[PDB]
Design an enzyme around this catalytic site. Structure first.
Site, short mmCIF file in Angstrom:
data_model
loop_
_atom_site.label_atom_id
_atom_site.label_comp_id
_atom_site.label_asym_id
_atom_site.label_seq_id
_atom_site.Cartn_x
_atom_site.Cartn_y
_atom_site.Cartn_z
N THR A 3 5.18 42.91 74.91
CA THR A 3 4.89 42.56 76.30
C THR A 3 4.78 43.82 77.15
O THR A 3 3.93 43.91 78.04
CB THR A 3 5.96 41.62 76.85
OG1 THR A 3 6.28 40.63 75.87
CG2 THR A 3 5.46 40.93 78.11
N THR A 4 5.64 44.81 76.89
CA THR A 4 5.49 46.10 77.54
C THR A 4 4.34 46.90 76.93
O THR A 4 3.83 47.83 77.56
CB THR A 4 6.78 46.91 77.45
OG1 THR A 4 7.17 47.02 76.07
CG2 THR A 4 7.90 46.22 78.22
N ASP B 135 12.81 36.08 70.74
CA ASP B 135 11.92 37.10 70.22
C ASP B 135 11.98 37.16 68.70
O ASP B 135 10.98 37.49 68.04
CB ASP B 135 12.27 38.46 70.82
CG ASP B 135 12.07 38.51 72.32
OD1 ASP B 135 11.60 37.50 72.89
OD2 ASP B 135 12.38 39.55 72.93
N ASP C 132 13.46 43.91 79.68
CA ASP C 132 12.52 43.09 78.94
C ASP C 132 11.21 42.96 79.71
O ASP C 132 11.21 42.88 80.94
CB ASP C 132 13.12 41.71 78.67
CG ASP C 132 12.22 40.84 77.82
OD1 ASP C 132 12.31 40.94 76.58
OD2 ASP C 132 11.43 40.06 78.39
N1 LIG Z 1 13.88 51.37 65.93
C1 LIG Z 1 12.66 51.65 66.44
N2 LIG Z 1 12.12 52.89 66.31
C2 LIG Z 1 10.91 53.18 66.82
N3 LIG Z 1 10.14 52.29 67.48
C3 LIG Z 1 10.56 51.01 67.67
C4 LIG Z 1 11.88 50.62 67.15
N4 LIG Z 1 12.05 49.33 67.48
C5 LIG Z 1 10.94 48.93 68.15
N5 LIG Z 1 10.06 49.93 68.27
C6 LIG Z 1 8.74 49.84 68.95
O1 LIG Z 1 8.90 49.40 70.30
C7 LIG Z 1 7.90 48.43 70.63
C8 LIG Z 1 8.50 47.35 71.52
O2 LIG Z 1 8.84 47.94 72.77
P1 LIG Z 1 9.77 47.19 73.86
O3 LIG Z 1 11.14 46.97 73.28
O4 LIG Z 1 9.64 47.94 75.16
O5 LIG Z 1 9.06 45.76 74.07
P2 LIG Z 1 9.96 44.42 74.03
O6 LIG Z 1 10.96 44.50 75.15
O7 LIG Z 1 10.42 44.20 72.61
O8 LIG Z 1 8.89 43.27 74.39
P3 LIG Z 1 9.42 41.86 74.95
O9 LIG Z 1 9.62 42.13 76.43
O10 LIG Z 1 8.31 40.89 74.63
O11 LIG Z 1 10.69 41.63 74.18
C9 LIG Z 1 7.36 47.88 69.33
O12 LIG Z 1 5.93 47.91 69.34
C10 LIG Z 1 7.88 48.80 68.24
O13 LIG Z 1 6.79 49.43 67.57
#
Ligand SMILES: Nc1ncnc2c1ncn2[C@@H]1O[C@H](COP(=O)(O)OP(=O)(O)OP(=O)(O)O)[C@@H](O)[C@H]1O
Ligand SMILES: Nc1ncnc2c1ncn2[C@@H]1O[C@H](COP(=O)(O)OP(=O)(O)OP(=O)(O)O)[C@@H](O)[C@H]1O
Lengths: 520, 519
Positions: free
Chosen positions: A87-88, A385, A54
């Site tokens: 956040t990433t 989230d 995360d």
């Molecule tokens: N099933 C999916 N297929 C393709 N892209 C996706 C999918 N789910 C999420 N994403 C993309 O991944 C991004 C989120 O990336 P990531 O999971 O690294 O951040 P996060 O961990 O959710 O952030 P935080 O730390 O705030 O929870 C989103 O902008 C979204 O567009």
């Protein structure tokens, strides 16, 4: 004082040193992007091990010493309440913006032209997001598509195996503490607790307040249907101080006298609950064995050993007040509840108190379960989230297709509008178009595919094939167009991702001198 | 074995002056890029590890603290600049070192420093009389009201900013804030507060004192906000039931006094609440947080209470209400109580805010910002503080000159023409004094990212034709008439910056030997 032993960085090399301080943060978190993001090992200061990917846990735990890297820590205090999903995404966007600005700094352009040029191209990318956004809940309210969008943001972690029943819980929790027409969702009105044992399917939605305290006696009734709860700090007994009573007895003439003096106090304050009309007696301290025998006969249950913040958390939801003693007992400060029950979990002796109102309340608590304690703290953040996405849906039901679909279409509009800028901010507008392509490029790199081959195929799809945007196949599905795969981001979460990324590059590029005094 | 120094650090001659000239430029290099409204900020961290982000030249030199002797001579000039005019520390620091840079090759060729002293006293005395001739008094020119003219100068100062689209709304609020004050104008009277959330149109101007009100304890559904003439009390006492400072611990072994022990601990809170009821204070403001029990006390007694107030906002409330800040509660009487006409609890921005309106000593105001970020409101606070500063100096001083390097390129042209008619050693020094004054339109082009040589070559060609008020523009990448574009500065601050930069340059040149005592 203290001019000797002071680190200094000025000139043109201080600009690239601040870039290298920000490039180290972006290159670590470009691998943890998307649902296929790589995990990160966290070594605690005392020796505990906890693994996660995360973004909000990375910035809070990365003990960095550079002040440019410390400015990257500052954005996490305001981003988690706003977007909660990128956040990433903003760290790789702030880093890749400085990557092409490092190329622009070799030409000799001043950073006050790059920070103004990035703000110029950000307003084009924000305006392009509103033209391509599609609504969900225009002119009506509905709860069916809100659960489907919540199932995608929740199942990005390891809790995807039970993502169905947990998505319906966060929808009903927001709709109880907040109205959709008021558009004022409070995060402090939604609490999340948890205990070890059980599965993820045993998550129950308790409309009220939960405390991890049992009754004063095992023979107490486990059902309070009347809405009269007395919340006090001193138990209904002979009076004892906060730390140690230490009653002094001399002989049998003092023991016989103090027993009758306590028997009046055992008879008065127990019967002082019935003169006001209260049923439950939530006290900060416990009860004695002589008081527990009298509470059984008069059908008045009581909660023992309630902690400090556990008292004030109950009186907010039930609408009560912290009463200091029995002399200030009135019926107006008594709490209200629909069902007060004690729920045990197998052979565990926790026996938490479940206070329910059985109506539409204003403070709802979520009790999650799991097989390990590291999953319970992961599922609490996972539901947190999900609470922000539903909060973004209420303030604006317009949404934009994420997963790289919004990033490539924004890069086409900025590069098209960059040719209409006849000044030195034109190179900064083309720099914003190249840095916008990095987030969908890092999505395909974490999925194990070729990053450049996956990117430019969508460029021919979003231009020659169709003007609606297509997503990047990140979860190894059948084909593109993640709108059919129901991976859709929010519009406020995508607009503030662009604005916060431009804000951090503006503060970094404007800083040109650091002075760090050492020890003497 | 018999030495005269024995650790005494002392040197004299020509290279002691060259070592003092080049040591003056390291202080000017610390504030070289901070000149201008679009200047770069510096990052200074203290010993505790807190990073300070600011571009003000007064805050940079106060945290530098260079142990060099010639560097300490630029500190007290920046201190005297705050007492003489109020600001301009980054202008006289840059101008002092560029006087020594142009005469630095002249010292090495064998010229005495005392002749350069006689040239700096001469050309600065001519610069005083030259400023007052070109300075025009604009009070009732072209039959326009002064309220319309004050919105025009703040429009150019707030241009090319975040609120450059809605600058018509922000220009009308900065004029009425200074107009609400008395004849004694002060930048400390008008405070700026920030409220997170909302668009830029929701920014409001409080005529009185408003603070953040981070009091997030209990006390809802009672304590009515509207009061006609409330008594404003400024306290520093904690009103919690279980406080960190107000407690009572007596160790007895009797069950009769155990009721009196808790009652005596409650009597510490109750007697401190009963003294506010006798004094008649309708509103209770305290720095320390107030518990939930004391909020139930004033709810039934028809009074208001709000804790967690900062001491900076309490002193602004003291200057508005006209009372006094009392720490204890037994001295709370009408001598320290305040008064106002309108007090209400507003819901601007989703959070609760308290503000008084209609004070007898209402000489303070409060500006409320609305936006999607706190760093958006942080740069808006400093830009609106700059917009107040241009408006405030226009009311005090009517005789103004054109800013943006227009008065610096005009002084460089007159002093060059005077040097051609003077024979002797005053030609090459005053002629170098005129070229050293061109660093203000040159560093204004460097900090704005423009071409520094393409503008300055066209700026001096405009002054050669007869342009007396042409300077650089921060918005457009060309020259413009700063008198027509309402880029102004008073003549008195431009005069006092020249006599301070010449005095700081004369103190370095007159020093030839450094005396150090071994201790
Ligand atoms: N099933 C999916 N297929 C393709 N892209 C996706 C999918 N789910 C999420 N994403 C993309 O991944 C991004 C989120 O990336 P990531 O999971 O690294 O951040 P996060 O961990 O959710 O952030 P935080 O730390 O705030 O929870 C989103 O902008 C979204 O567009
Ligand atoms: N709106 C403007 N347009 C063009 N030039 C300006 C503007 N405002 C200020 N200047 C120029 O910038 C110079 C001062 O820059 P800056 O504001 O960084 O220093 P300062 O804070 O005024 O210094 P000090 O506090 O010593 O007066 C002045 O010489 C003035 O001519």
């Amino acid at each position: 004082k203290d001019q000797d032993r002071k680190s200094r960085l000025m000139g043109l090399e201080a600009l690239k040193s601040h870039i290298m301080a920000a490039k180290a943060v972006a290159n670590t978190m470009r691998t943890s992007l998307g649902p296929n993001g790589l995990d990160k090992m966290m070594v605690d200061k005392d020796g505990d091990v906890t693994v996660t990917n995360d973004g909000a846990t990375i910035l809070s735990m990365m003990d960095v010493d550079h002040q440019i890297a410390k400015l990257m820590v500052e954005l996490s205090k305001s981003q988690d309440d706003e977007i909660g999903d990128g956040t990433t995404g903003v760290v790789v966007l702030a880093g890749a913006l400085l990557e092409e600005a490092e190329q622009l700094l070799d030409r000799g352009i001043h950073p006050i032209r790059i920070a103004d040029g990035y703000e110029q191209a950000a307003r084009v990318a924000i305006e392009h997001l509103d033209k391509i956004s599609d609504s969900v809940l225009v002119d009506i309210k509905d709860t069916e598509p809100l659960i489907q969008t919540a199932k995608t943001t929740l199942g990005s972690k390891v809790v995807n195996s039970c993502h169905r029943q947990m998505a319906e819980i966060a929808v009903n929790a927001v709709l109880t503490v907040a109205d959709m027409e008021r558009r004022d969702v409070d995060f402090e009105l939604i609490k999340v607790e948890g205990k070890v044992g059980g599965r993820l399917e045993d998550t129950k939605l308790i409309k009220g307040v939960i405390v991890d305290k049992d009754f004063s006696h095992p023979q107490m009734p486990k059902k309070v249907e009347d809405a009269k709860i007395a919340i006090l700090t001193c138990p209904f007994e002979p009076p004892k101080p906060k730390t140690k009573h230490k009653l002094d007895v001399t002989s049998v003439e003092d023991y016989k006298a103090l027993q009758k003096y306590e028997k009046e106090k055992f008879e008065e304050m127990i019967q002082q609950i019935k003169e006001t009309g209260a049923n439950l007696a939530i006290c900060q301290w416990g009860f004695d064995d002589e008081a527990n025998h009298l509470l059984l006969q008069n059908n008045l249950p009581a909660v023992r050993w309630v902690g400090g913040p556990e008292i004030e958390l109950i009186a907010i939801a039930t609408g009560g007040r912290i009463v200091p003693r029995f002399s200030e007992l009135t019926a107006e400060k008594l709490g209200f509840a629909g069902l007060v029950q004690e729920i045990s979990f197998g052979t565990t002796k926790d026996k938490m108190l479940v206070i329910e109102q059985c109506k539409n309340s204003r403070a709802v608590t979520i009790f999650i379960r799991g097989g390990n304690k590291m999953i319970i703290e992961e599922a609490k953040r996972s539901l947190h989230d999900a609470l922000c996405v539903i909060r973004n849906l209420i303030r604006d039901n317009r949404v934009v297709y994420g997963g790289g679909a919004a990033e490539i279409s924004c890069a086409l509009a900025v590069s098209q509008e960059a040719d209409k800028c006849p000044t030195l901010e034109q190179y900064a507008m083309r720099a914003f178009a190249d840095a916008l392509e990095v987030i969908p490029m890092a999505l395909s790199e974490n999925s194990g595919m070729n990053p450049i081959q996956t990117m430019t195929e969508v460029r021919a799809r979003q231009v020659k094939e169709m003007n609606p945007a297509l997503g990047i196949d990140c979860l190894h599905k059948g084909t593109n167009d993640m709108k059919q795969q129901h991976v859709i981001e929010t519009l406020i979460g995508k607009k503030q991702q662009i604005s916060l990324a431009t804000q951090m590059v503006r503060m970094i590029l404007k800083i040109d001198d650091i002075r760090k005094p050492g020890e003497s | 074995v018999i030495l005269l120094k024995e650790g005494t650090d002392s040197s004299q001659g020509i290279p002691q002056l060259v070592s003092n000239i080049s040591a003056c430029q390291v202080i000017a290099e610390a504030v070289r890029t901070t000149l201008g409204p679009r200047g770069m900020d510096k990052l200074i961290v203290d010993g505790r590890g807190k990073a300070t982000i600011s571009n003000d030249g007064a805050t940079i030199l106060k945290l530098l603290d260079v142990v060099h002797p010639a560097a300490k001579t630029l500190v007290d000039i920046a201190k005297s600049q705050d007492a003489e005019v109020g600001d301009g520390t980054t202008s006289v620091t840059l101008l002092a070192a560029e006087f020594l840079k142009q005469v630095k090759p002249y010292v090495e060729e064998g010229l005495h420093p005392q002749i350069i002293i006689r040239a700096f006293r001469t050309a600065t005395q001519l610069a005083v009389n030259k400023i007052k001739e070109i300075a025009v008094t604009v009070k009732k020119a072209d039959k326009v009201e002064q309220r319309k003219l004050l919105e025009k100068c703040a429009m150019t100062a707030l241009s090319s900013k975040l609120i450059s689209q809605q600058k018509a709304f922000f220009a009308k609020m900065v004029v009425d804030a200074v107009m609400m004050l008395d004849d004694l104008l002060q930048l400390k009277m008008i405070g700026i507060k920030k409220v997170q959330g909302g668009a830029l149109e929701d920014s409001q101007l409080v005529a009185g004192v408003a603070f953040k009100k981070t009091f997030s304890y209990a006390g809802f559904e009672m304590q009515p906000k509207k009061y006609h003439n409330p008594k404003i009390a400024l306290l520093n006492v904690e009103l919690e039931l279980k406080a960190e400072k107000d407690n009572a611990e007596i160790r007895v072994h009797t069950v009769e006094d155990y009721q009196a022990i808790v009652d005596a601990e409650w009597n510490i809170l109750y007697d401190k609440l009963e003294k506010i009821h006798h004094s008649g204070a309708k509103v209770v403001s305290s720095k320390l947080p107030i518990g939930d029990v004391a909020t139930q006390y004033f709810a039934d007694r028809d009074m208001f209470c709000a804790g967690r107030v900062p001491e900076e906002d309490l002193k602004r409330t003291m200057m508005a209400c006209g009372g006094s800040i009392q720490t204890s509660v037994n001295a709370l009487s009408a001598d320290v109580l305040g008064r106002c006409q309108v007090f209400e609890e507003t819901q601007i921005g989703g959070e609760r805010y308290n503000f008084f309106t209609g004070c007898p000593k209402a000489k303070t105001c409060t500006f409320i910002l609305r936006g999607g970020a706190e760093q958006f409101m942080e740069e808006t606070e400093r830009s609106l503080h700059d917009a107040i500063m241009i408006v405030r100096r226009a009311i005090k001083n009517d005789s103004v000159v054109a800013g943006g390097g227009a008065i610096e390129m005009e002084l460089s042209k007159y002093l060059r023409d005077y040097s051609r008619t003077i024979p002797g050693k005053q030609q090459l020094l005053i002629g170098a004094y005129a070229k050293a004054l061109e660093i203000i339109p040159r560093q204004l082009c460097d900090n704005a990212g423009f071409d520094a040589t393409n503008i300055l070559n066209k700026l001096r060609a405009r002054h050669a034709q007869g342009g007396t008020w042409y300077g650089v523009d921060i918005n457009n990448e060309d020259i413009a008439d700063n008198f027509e574009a309402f880029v102004w500065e008073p003549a008195m601050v431009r005069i006092n910056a020249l006599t301070a930069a010449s005095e700081a340059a004369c103190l370095i040149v007159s020093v030839d030997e450094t005396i150090k005592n071994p201790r």
